[PDB]
Amino acid sequence: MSYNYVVTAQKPTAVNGCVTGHFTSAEDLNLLIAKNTRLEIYVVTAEGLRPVKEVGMYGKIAVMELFRPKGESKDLLFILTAKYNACILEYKQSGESIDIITRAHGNVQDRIGRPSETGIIGIIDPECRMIGLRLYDGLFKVIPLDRDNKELKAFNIRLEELHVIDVKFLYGCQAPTICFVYQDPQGRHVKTYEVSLREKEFNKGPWKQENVEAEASMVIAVPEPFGGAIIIGQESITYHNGDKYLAIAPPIIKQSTIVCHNRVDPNGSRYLLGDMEGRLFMLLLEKEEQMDGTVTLKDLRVELLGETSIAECLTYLDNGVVFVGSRLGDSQLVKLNVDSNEQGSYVVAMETFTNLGPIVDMCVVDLERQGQGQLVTCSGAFKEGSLRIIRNGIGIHEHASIDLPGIKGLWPLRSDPNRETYDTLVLSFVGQTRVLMLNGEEVEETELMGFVDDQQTFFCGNVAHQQLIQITSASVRLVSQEPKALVSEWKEPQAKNISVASCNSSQVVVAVGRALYYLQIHPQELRQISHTEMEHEVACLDITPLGDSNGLSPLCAIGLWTDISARILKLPSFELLHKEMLGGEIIPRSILMTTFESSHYLLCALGDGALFYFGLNIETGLLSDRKKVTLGTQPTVLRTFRSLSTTNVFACSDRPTVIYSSNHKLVFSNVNLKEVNYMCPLNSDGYPDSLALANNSTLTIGTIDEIQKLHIRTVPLYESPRKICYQEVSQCFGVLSSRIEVQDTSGGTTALRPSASTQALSSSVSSSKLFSSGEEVEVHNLLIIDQHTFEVLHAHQFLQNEYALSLVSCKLGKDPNTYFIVGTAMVYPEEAEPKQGRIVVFQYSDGKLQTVAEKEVKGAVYSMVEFNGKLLASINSTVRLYEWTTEKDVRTECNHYNNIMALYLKTKGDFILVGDLMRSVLLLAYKPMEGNFEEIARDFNPNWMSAVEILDDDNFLGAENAFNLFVCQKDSAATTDEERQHLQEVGLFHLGEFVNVFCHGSLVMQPTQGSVLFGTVNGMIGLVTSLSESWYNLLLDMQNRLNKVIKSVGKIEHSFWRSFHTERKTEPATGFIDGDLIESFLDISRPKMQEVVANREATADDLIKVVEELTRIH
């Protein structure tokens, strides 16, 4: 009886891999970024990286390698998915539109063999003869490369070496030759094997086995000039080739592990090296030309260049620009310099990329007291940690607000032929026109000489020769500024009132029904250039210099009335060019042409609230992209403004939208406002670069926010955040963080760098006497952070070796205060289970943090939750309730305990509890008879849980080590005493992410039921709703139809992909739906769209609407 729905709310921002090469064209350099399920494709250029194509996969990318097989134009791409889907891809730009074609594919799973530790490794011989995979212990799978094998039939070869750490193929080999570091009893060794794909053996290897360092872990294969292997370990780097051994041990490397590498120079004379600490190194190999005897390695050298952001990923791009792919922090572009600038760093950051890092914990808060949802996350680790604030929509902050109901139009107005600090604004009302003024922050209201004030205006712009245009409905008029006179006045030959305007700066194109007159503002007067009559009444018009001129508009756009059509015309003549009918019979409200970058655009808003869009040539005209993209229910009125570099289209309606530029596409964000109807840009002497806006009855003036559909603040903590609780009554946050300190001369801990907890505006330490129980330490602190500034107001440091594990903000018993309570644990040298910790009760009262109470406790406090007046806390396998006395004491009755280790814990506003103990989800309710918790229900079946939530009283969402989701439900059947004790898994779904936190909230609000947000390790935010019978069924339908149509990159079945997959089973998806997949219904060519939806009613335009109601869900 379970019907669920999951849409992505924010795509994964962490980077899992990145590879460089020539895959777009041989004449090009690309950077390829791997997400989880996304491949991002860039062209390296002068100004930086230009994005060409972003594609989705039905799999987590786990191997990503470019190669050129003999007689091949450009690089081909190899991708191995985590569920064992392989495939080779080609980039084909044939059409002015792009394609990732699958040259080959096939699934390389094996019924046998355990997943190797250190994971899937994918490698390719320099001769592109073959692909070597290392998927499982004992088994090395081979795929031959030759022009067929379009299914990638493979074979395995037994590998005697049980425990393989890393592998590459060697360069300069007269047969493929593998080179690996394996572990066995006596440490780790490097060994070679030839691959005889002819007979499928391993044969011997080119050179015998040697021992390596106990922590050897990276193998580098260096190309032909030198050819050999480099082995990076801890405290040692070594070159190996035949009987040539070179070894260095520079202490500079002895701290942090080396974690990634890239080669800079094809010769392979310089490699980049990435630490876990962000240190970047250059590895240099020095060459030796031997009076006629090739080149050899004389030595190796390392050199610290500076620091990045912990890197998964390091790609030397060109010209000393490295891309640093990061996962625990923001990714970034970086320039390596020859001279070490200030600080003595050779690394200078050019560019930074937002990663929500691991989202470790989060909470939703209506932060700026608007009935909306904002999200704040603990993100990153180490000297990369931060908070992130995530808000929905574009916003605007307000300067002045003046009331003036039933306005029907506005245009800006500078009062000088020089200075673009416009100082006047003029409102059109029903049949009036009142004029204003600006002394800066003020708005006084008298008119100018020659401005009709009993006529509704349809224009209030600027022209030529110290002159101010006013195309009122009465008559297109002219008023100069210095001459302050009516220098001209046009009227309609028949005394017919005017209808639709159109006015740039140096041109005019009115209309009086189906009629059209083209006038001119050349030296100080009006000039009737033209006149045509249209087939039907004119709804709307538009004219603006689209490039090759600066006032003289070459073409025009026009909305009609009966045939509901838009058209292009040549303006000195009005000669009908190309015209396009749209469906239906509601009128075009607005039409607009705009100059962006490399697609000249024109769009049309209708009046029911629909919009249609078409690019075109300012030179000629070609009917472009068609996808009806609704917005408000009110007729949208388009407009142009000025902003940052690129300037945009602002949709005016009940659903204020802004249309930006995506890939080279166009952005759709909500503007977080009540409703706008008319909106004009600005730059005044009271409100410079800004905007003007009129609602029902208000006028407003402010500055547009960022750009994206989600807007993201960052708060560098320079250390690790672990937990977060909002405190409304204190208007602040509580955050547990930790930092790494290290040995000093004193033996005591020092500090690697300043961080939140060391740089706080006020601080304090733990002075509890509760206990008498070269190296790295953790210091855990509790931070108090201001909800408005986000300054670290105060930071309490816990005791030596106290790790805080849980945090809560609540009231207790009858005490009216709200406290922050923190569950800790005492973490000694080598004692696995810890047997001590504390529950500390803190007070953040007027100004400072107060230590109220303490209670010692015998074990780690893994989780805690305020139940129904008491503090329910899980201490190391035991679950106890606590009482908050009136003396402010926390007490329990040691005889009322529990045999549960709740790594994860939630509560229903009743007497219920979702726990996890021995890999199992648990239901428990409070029995006051026994003062206990009673085990109402369980979910047998293993589940290495990572997170847990209550959906309602009988349904329970859960997430697990294998990237699957599942819902548990209690049985509604007899045997209430057996069948009742087994709750059951009514829904399954392979998410592809690792969930750290669920929480009840939304980022939408000022169709479906409920909403729970979750945060990933990859920084992905998601959302889950409940549905009905009809939808889950309609949608389930939709999906199956949708797979049939939709192309799928490496030929992968969405059905395989989404099916719940562990080690103990693989069942198909139940009770779930990915809105992700549903939403791509709107991203379809109507042809395909009429295939799906071949039958409740049964229409595309019935359905195109259904999906949009869900897009509004986040």
Nearer to other proteins, 876 or 941 (CB): 876
User: What is the closest distance, in whole angstroms, from the C-beta atom of residue 853 to other proteins in the complex?
Assistant: 23
* Strand residues in 638-797 grouped as ranges (E): 649-651, 657-659, 668-670, 678-681, 691-694, 698-704, 710-716, 720-727, 732-742, 763-765, 776-786, 792-797
Distance CA 667, CA 601 (A): 13
Distance CA 580, CA 623 (A): 8
User: What is the closest distance, in whole angstroms, from the C-beta atom of residue 357 to other proteins in the complex?
Assistant: 9
User: What is the closest distance, in whole angstroms, from the C-beta atom of residue 1017 to other proteins in the complex?
Assistant: 5
DSSP-assigned states of every residue in 39-97: EEEEEE-SSSEEEEEEEE-SS-EEEEEEE--SS-SS-EEEEEETTSEEEEEEEE--SSS
User: What is the closest distance, in whole angstroms, from the C-beta atom of residue 6 to other proteins in the complex?
Assistant: 21
User: What is the closest distance, in whole angstroms, from the C-beta atom of residue 360 to other proteins in the complex?
Assistant: 5
Determine the distance from the C-alpha atom of residue 271 to the mean position of all C-alpha atoms in its chain, rounded to a whole number.
Answer: 31
Contact (Cβ atoms closer than 8 angstroms) between residue 991 and residue 981: no
Nearer to other proteins, 240 or 722 (CB): 722
User: What is the closest distance, in whole angstroms, from the C-beta atom of residue 426 to other proteins in the complex?
Assistant: 59
Nearer to other proteins, 544 or 996 (CB): 996
Nearer to other proteins, 801 or 969 (CB): 801
Amino acid 722 reads R
- Tokens 């029911």, residue located: 608
Query: What is the 3 state secondary structure string of 163-231?
Result: EEEEEEECCCCCCCEEEEEEEECCEEEEEEEECECCCCECCCCCCCCEEECCCCCEEEEECCCCCEEEE
User: What is the closest distance, in whole angstroms, from the C-beta atom of residue 601 to other proteins in the complex?
Assistant: 42
User: What is the closest distance, in whole angstroms, from the C-beta atom of residue 358 to other proteins in the complex?
Assistant: 5
User: What is the closest distance, in whole angstroms, from the C-beta atom of residue 271 to other proteins in the complex?
Assistant: 23
| CB-based burial label for 990 (10 Å; 0-12, 13-18, 19+) | buried
Nearer to other proteins, 564 or 717 (CB): 717
Determine the distance from the C-alpha atom of residue 835 to the mean position of all C-alpha atoms in its chain, rounded to a whole number.
Answer: 41
User: What is the closest distance, in whole angstroms, from the C-beta atom of residue 996 to other proteins in the complex?
Assistant: 6
Nearer to other proteins, 360 or 558 (CB): 360
DSSP-assigned states of every residue in 6-42: EEEEE---S--EEEEE--S-TT--EEEEE-SSEEEEE
Residues 6+ apart with CB under 8 A from 230: 219, 220, 222, 237, 238, 239, 240, 271, 283, 300
User: What is the closest distance, in whole angstroms, from the C-beta atom of residue 1096 to other proteins in the complex?
Assistant: 45
User: What is the closest distance, in whole angstroms, from the C-beta atom of residue 803 to other proteins in the complex?
Assistant: 6
Kindly state the tokens that stand for 266.
Answer: 């094809």
User: What is the closest distance, in whole angstroms, from the C-beta atom of residue 722 to other proteins in the complex?
Assistant: 7
Angstrom CA distances, 346 to 264, 283, 305, 306, 335, stand at: 15, 14, 5, 6, 8
How many helices (H) and strands (E) the chain has is answered by 5, 80
Nearer to other proteins, 519 or 825 (CB): 825
Output phi, psi for 52, to 5 deg. Answer: -110, -35
Distance CA 253, CA 272 (A): 13
Nearer to other proteins, 24 or 996 (CB): 996
Residues 6+ apart with CB under 8 A from 907: 865, 867, 872, 913, 914, 950
Nearer to other proteins, 365 or 378 (CB): 378
Nearer to other proteins, 98 or 903 (CB): 903
Distance CA 1027, CA 1081 (A): 19
User: What is the closest distance, in whole angstroms, from the C-beta atom of residue 776 to other proteins in the complex?
Assistant: 11
User: What is the closest distance, in whole angstroms, from the C-beta atom of residue 835 to other proteins in the complex?
Assistant: 12
User: What is the closest distance, in whole angstroms, from the C-beta atom of residue 631 to other proteins in the complex?
Assistant: 40
Nearer to other proteins, 168 or 780 (CB): 780
Nearer to other proteins, 182 or 382 (CB): 382
Kindly state the tokens that stand for 77.
Answer: 């791409």
Count the alpha carbons within 13 Å of 556 in the hemisphere toward its beta carbon.
Answer: 27
Nearer to other proteins, 901 or 988 (CB): 901
User: What is the closest distance, in whole angstroms, from the C-beta atom of residue 288 to other proteins in the complex?
Assistant: 40
Nearer to other proteins, 190 or 825 (CB): 825
Nearer to other proteins, 466 or 877 (CB): 877
By the criterion CB under 8 A, which residues form the site for other proteins?
Answer: 327-328, 358, 360, 381, 722, 803, 805, 825, 827, 831-834, 860, 862, 903, 946, 994, 996, 1017
Q: Is 943 helix (H, G, I), strand (E, B) or coil?
A: coil
Sign of CA dihedral 433, 438, 442, 446: negative
Contact (Cβ atoms closer than 8 angstroms) between residue 914 and residue 892: no
H/E stretch holding 1040 reads helix 1029-1045
User: What is the closest distance, in whole angstroms, from the C-beta atom of residue 825 to other proteins in the complex?
Assistant: 6
Q: Is 384 helix (H, G, I), strand (E, B) or coil?
A: helix
Nearer to other proteins, 213 or 384 (CB): 384
Nearer to other proteins, 50 or 835 (CB): 835
Nearer to other proteins, 124 or 376 (CB): 376
Nearest CA-CA partner of 666 in 627, 621, 704 = 627
Q: Torsion angle of alpha carbons 109, 113, 115, 118, nearest 10°?
A: -110
Count the alpha carbons within 13 Å of 273 in the hemisphere toward its beta carbon.
Answer: 25
- Tokens 């899937």, residue located: 120
Distance CA 830, CA 875 (A): 19
Kindly state the tokens that stand for 338.
Answer: 């020859």
Distance CA 303, CA 272 (A): 10
What residues pair up with 704 in beta bridges, in sequence order? 396
Determine the distance from the C-alpha atom of residue 51 to the mean position of all C-alpha atoms in its chain, rounded to a whole number.
Answer: 16
